[PDB]
């Protein structure tokens, strides 16, 4: 039989220290192609090892298609091929788009659903998985209004470091219990709470909305250092601002409470992804 492997690379949709992401075409269909830098080869190996262990399939997880290694004259070329989401990342989407109650809840409940799916061990099934770099750039928006979680290059399984702006206090103060898988779930819940803040700001109530800002925009520089983050999060124990206008809206009042239960200094006090889902299903 003929095994069609040609992918036409059409448009670069992302370039960074990680490498590049391209919109590509296989057999008439859009795919996304991540081409890894030499600097980030271990992220390709980790995501490939995970998908060789468990073929994750969930509506709120970016859909895997292929991992390809190709021999070149003097180098190895590493590609990850996934489903393509033309609306782009949640980070991108929130820059100009505002939300209503239904769209805001649908976004955040879809993220919580993908995250609970990663976290929960299924017997017979899948190992428990923690993501370790959850943020709005690692979430894609689908045409149906739900999102999906991307980038398992730092993921850990149980049966590069995270983006510093989103690091939990125990990562910044190096107290994290590294031999305990639950520690890594609790670092993802902290980062989830920051994403929930970023999205809620863009939900309109009584004619008011906040501009898009990243977490801690008002207290750290761009590309904040590890020390900049530690002083804010660990020493001063700052948390993102909840605007007064949220307390006139029942949805944003409930979301403020939720985000505050993702941000406890004590990791074991934070809500679980399953409890976040249940709370979101009871809002509105
Ligand atoms: C090697 O590389 C790539 C391959 C492909 C691809 C292209 N056509 C057909 C296939 C195919 C799938 C599955 C079977 C099965 C049939 C049932 N039988 C019992 C076991 C075998 C055969 C063939 C593949 C996997 C796409 C690629 O990119 C999108 C590849 O590059 C990453
Ligand atoms: C990698 O990705 C894509 C792959 C393909 C594709 C191409 N040839 C053959 C297949 C295939 C056929 C048959 C089985 C068998 C498995 C065992 N048993 C006997 C029942 C069924 C498995 C695989 C596929 C899945 C199509 C795709 O899209 C249309 C892909 O997505 C981009
Ligand atoms: C986060 O990480 C990964 C993401 C993706 C990925 C999947 N679908 C779509 C995208 C995308 C498409 C289009 C735009 C732009 C271009 C047009 N318009 C002006 C604004 C929107 C942005 C983004 C990406 C980047 C793939 C990955 O791997 C193959 C990723 O890494 C795991």
Curated annotation (Swiss-Prot):
One of its GO terms (biological process) is transforming growth factor beta receptor signaling pathway. GO terms for cellular component: activin receptor complex; apical part of cell; BMP receptor complex; plasma membrane. Residues 1-284 are cytoplasmic. This is Activin receptor type-1. Interacts with FKBP1A. Interacts with FCHO1. Interacts with CLU. Interacts with type II receptors AMHR2 and ACVR2A. Interacts with BMP7. Interacts with GDF2/BMP9. Interacts with BMP6 (when glycosylated); the interaction may induce HAMP expression. Interacts with TSC22D1/TSC-22. It is an enzyme of class 2 (transferase). Keywords: ATP-binding, Disease variant, Glycoprotein, Kinase, Magnesium, Manganese, Membrane, Metal-binding, Nucleotide-binding, Phosphoprotein, Receptor, Serine/threonine-protein kinase, Signal, Transferase, Transmembrane, Transmembrane helix. Bone morphogenetic protein (BMP) type I receptor that is involved in a wide variety of biological processes, including bone, heart, cartilage, nervous, and reproductive system development and regulation. As a type I receptor, forms heterotetrameric receptor complexes with the type II receptors AMHR2, ACVR2A or ACVR2B. Upon binding of ligands such as BMP7 or GDF2/BMP9 to the heteromeric complexes, type II receptors transphosphorylate ACVR1 intracellular domain. In turn, ACVR1 kinase domain is activated and subsequently phosphorylates SMAD1/5/8 proteins that transduce the signal. Its EC number is 2.7.11.30. It is linked to Fibrodysplasia ossificans progressiva: A rare autosomal dominant connective tissue disorder resulting in skeletal malformations and progressive extraskeletal ossification. Heterotopic ossification begins in childhood and can be induced by trauma or may occur without warning. Bone formation is episodic and progressive, leading to a debilitating ankylosis of all major joints of the axial and appendicular skeleton, rendering movement impossible. It catalyses: L-threonyl-[receptor-protein] + ATP = O-phospho-L-threonyl-[receptor-protein] + ADP + H(+); L-seryl-[receptor-protein] + ATP = O-phospho-L-seryl-[receptor-protein] + ADP + H(+). The chain holds residues 202 to 499 of 509 of the full protein. The gene is ACVR1. It is a single-pass type I membrane protein.
């Amino acid at each position: 039989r003929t095994v069609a492997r040609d992918i036409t690379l059409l448009e670069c949709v992302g370039k960074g220290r990680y490498g590049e992401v391209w919109r590509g075409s296989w057999q008439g269909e859009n795919v996304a192609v991540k081409i890894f830098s030499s600097r980030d080869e271990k992220s390709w190996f980790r995501e490939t090892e995970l998908y060789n262990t468990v073929m994750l399939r969930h509506e709120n997880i970016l859909g895997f298609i292929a991992s390809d290694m190709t021999s070149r004259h003097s180098s190895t070329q590493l590609w990850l091929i996934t489903h393509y989401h033309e609306m782009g990342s949640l980070y991108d989407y929130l820059q100009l788009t505002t939300l209503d109650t239904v769209s805001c809840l649908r976004i955040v409940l879809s993220i919580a659903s993908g995250l609970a799916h990663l976290h929960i061990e299924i017997f017979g099934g899948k190992p428990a998985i923690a993501h370790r770099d959850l943020k709005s750039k690692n979430i894609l928006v689908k045409k149906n209004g739900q999102c999906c979680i991307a980038d398992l290059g730092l993921a850990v399984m149980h049966s590069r470091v995270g983006t510093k702006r989103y690091m939990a206090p125990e990562v910044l103060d190096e107290t994290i219990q590294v031999d305990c898988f639950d520690s890594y779930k609790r670092v993802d819940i902290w980062a989830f709470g920051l994403v929930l803040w970023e999205v809620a700001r863009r939900m309109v109530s009584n004619g008011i909305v906040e501009d898009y800002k990243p977490p801690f925009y008002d207290v750290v520089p761009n590309d904040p250092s590890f020390e900049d983050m530690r002083k804010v999060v660990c020493v001063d124990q700052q948390r993102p601002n909840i605007p007064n206008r949220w307390f006139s809206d029942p949805t944003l009042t409930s979301l403020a409470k939720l985000m505050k239960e993702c941000w406890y200094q004590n990791p074991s006090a934070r809500l679980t992804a399953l409890r976040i889902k249940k709370t979101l299903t009871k809002i509105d």
